[PDB]
Design an enzyme around this catalytic site. Structure first.
Site, PDB file in Angstrom:
ATOM      1  N   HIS A  41     -62.042 -37.975  52.255  1.00 35.53           N
ATOM      2  CA  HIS A  41     -62.673 -38.721  51.149  1.00 35.53           C
ATOM      3  C   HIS A  41     -63.587 -37.869  50.320  1.00 35.53           C
ATOM      4  O   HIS A  41     -63.981 -36.737  50.695  1.00 35.53           O
ATOM      5  CB  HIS A  41     -63.364 -40.023  51.648  1.00 35.53           C
ATOM      6  CG  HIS A  41     -64.733 -39.793  52.214  1.00 35.53           C
ATOM      7  ND1 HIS A  41     -65.790 -40.640  51.982  1.00 35.53           N
ATOM      8  CD2 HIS A  41     -65.230 -38.763  52.948  1.00 35.53           C
ATOM      9  CE1 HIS A  41     -66.869 -40.168  52.586  1.00 35.53           C
ATOM     10  NE2 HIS A  41     -66.563 -39.007  53.141  1.00 35.53           N
ATOM     11  N   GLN A 113     -67.241 -48.464  57.779  1.00 33.75           N
ATOM     12  CA  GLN A 113     -67.595 -49.653  56.996  1.00 33.75           C
ATOM     13  C   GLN A 113     -66.305 -50.396  56.648  1.00 33.75           C
ATOM     14  O   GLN A 113     -65.268 -49.757  56.364  1.00 33.75           O
ATOM     15  CB  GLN A 113     -68.296 -49.214  55.734  1.00 33.75           C
ATOM     16  CG  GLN A 113     -69.188 -48.028  55.996  1.00 33.75           C
ATOM     17  CD  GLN A 113     -70.241 -47.811  54.949  1.00 33.75           C
ATOM     18  OE1 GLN A 113     -70.985 -48.741  54.597  1.00 33.75           O
ATOM     19  NE2 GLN A 113     -70.348 -46.578  54.465  1.00 33.75           N
ATOM     20  N   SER A 136     -72.428 -46.786  51.051  1.00 35.74           N
ATOM     21  CA  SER A 136     -72.692 -45.357  50.811  1.00 35.74           C
ATOM     22  C   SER A 136     -72.595 -44.891  49.367  1.00 35.74           C
ATOM     23  O   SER A 136     -73.216 -43.897  48.999  1.00 35.74           O
ATOM     24  CB  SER A 136     -71.682 -44.541  51.575  1.00 35.74           C
ATOM     25  OG  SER A 136     -71.817 -44.837  52.937  1.00 35.74           O
TER      26      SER A 136
HETATM   27  O1  LIG Z   1     -75.369 -41.411  54.355  1.00 38.11           O
HETATM   28  C1  LIG Z   1     -74.361 -41.990  53.949  1.00 38.11           C
HETATM   29  O2  LIG Z   1     -74.500 -43.093  53.401  1.00 38.11           O
HETATM   30  C2  LIG Z   1     -72.953 -41.401  54.249  1.00 38.11           C
HETATM   31  N1  LIG Z   1     -71.869 -42.150  54.467  1.00 38.11           N
HETATM   32  C3  LIG Z   1     -70.813 -41.317  54.685  1.00 38.11           C
HETATM   33  C4  LIG Z   1     -69.528 -41.784  54.985  1.00 38.11           C
HETATM   34  C5  LIG Z   1     -68.719 -41.104  55.909  1.00 38.11           C
HETATM   35  C6  LIG Z   1     -67.449 -41.577  56.252  1.00 38.11           C
HETATM   36  C7  LIG Z   1     -66.975 -42.773  55.698  1.00 38.11           C
HETATM   37  C8  LIG Z   1     -67.798 -43.456  54.803  1.00 38.11           C
HETATM   38  C9  LIG Z   1     -69.068 -42.974  54.455  1.00 38.11           C
HETATM   39  N2  LIG Z   1     -71.246 -40.027  54.654  1.00 38.11           N
HETATM   40  C10 LIG Z   1     -72.558 -40.054  54.389  1.00 38.11           C
HETATM   41  C11 LIG Z   1     -73.447 -38.800  54.231  1.00 38.11           C
HETATM   42  O3  LIG Z   1     -74.532 -38.886  53.639  1.00 38.11           O
HETATM   43  O4  LIG Z   1     -73.083 -37.693  54.664  1.00 38.11           O
END
Ligand SMILES: O=C(O)c1nc(-c2ccccc2)[nH]c1C(=O)O
Length: 145
Positions: A41, A113, A136
């Protein structure tokens, strides 16, 4: 049709096209459960993100609408072949998985999520989502396995 897919009509041109309401993918061609999928992603964060901070930028101040514009330009470039997904992910994703070309590893239901999960499991191997909204920020999701 296959899951989440409805037929639609182009505003610009009048040809039918297909839209997926779980992944937000749209395409012209007619379209075409695993315990596990593997996805990469590209995340674009905005001021209302659960964590408005990233390796790219200490305080994320861009607005949700501005985040969506960035996502859309990256989707245009990826679909035209001007840039590839991994390379935009590496440079521009607000997730620390940017360091791995966006790769998140394989995961099953129960882990992400729900909107990210639902999108990942509706894509087929190889397919890319449209903009996917979670707490996010905004994602473009590539299902690799
Ligand atoms: O803090 C966040 O909000 C975050 N959320 C995600 C994420 C990873 C996998 C799938 C969906 C979201 N990566 C982050 C990050 O900062 O590194």
């Amino acid at each position: 049709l296959p899951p989440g897919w409805e037929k639609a009509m182009s505003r610009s041109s009048g040809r039918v096209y297909y839209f997926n309401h779980i992944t937000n993918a749209s395409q012209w061609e007619r379209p075409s459960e695993p315990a596990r999928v593997r996805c990469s992603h590209l995340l674009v964060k905005h001021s209302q993100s659960r964590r408005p901070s990233s390796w790219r930028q200490e305080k994320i101040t861009r607005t949700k609408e501005e985040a969506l514009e960035l996502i859309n330009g990256y989707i245009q470039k990826i679909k035209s072949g001007e840039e590839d997904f991994e390379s935009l992910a590496s440079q521009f994703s607000d997730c620390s998985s940017a360091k791995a070309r966006g790769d998140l590893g394989a995961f099953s239901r129960g882990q992400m999520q729900k909107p990210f999960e639902d999108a990942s499991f509706a894509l087929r191997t190889g397919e890319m989502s449209g903009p996917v909204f979670t707490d996010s920020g905004i994602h473009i999701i590539l299902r690799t396995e």
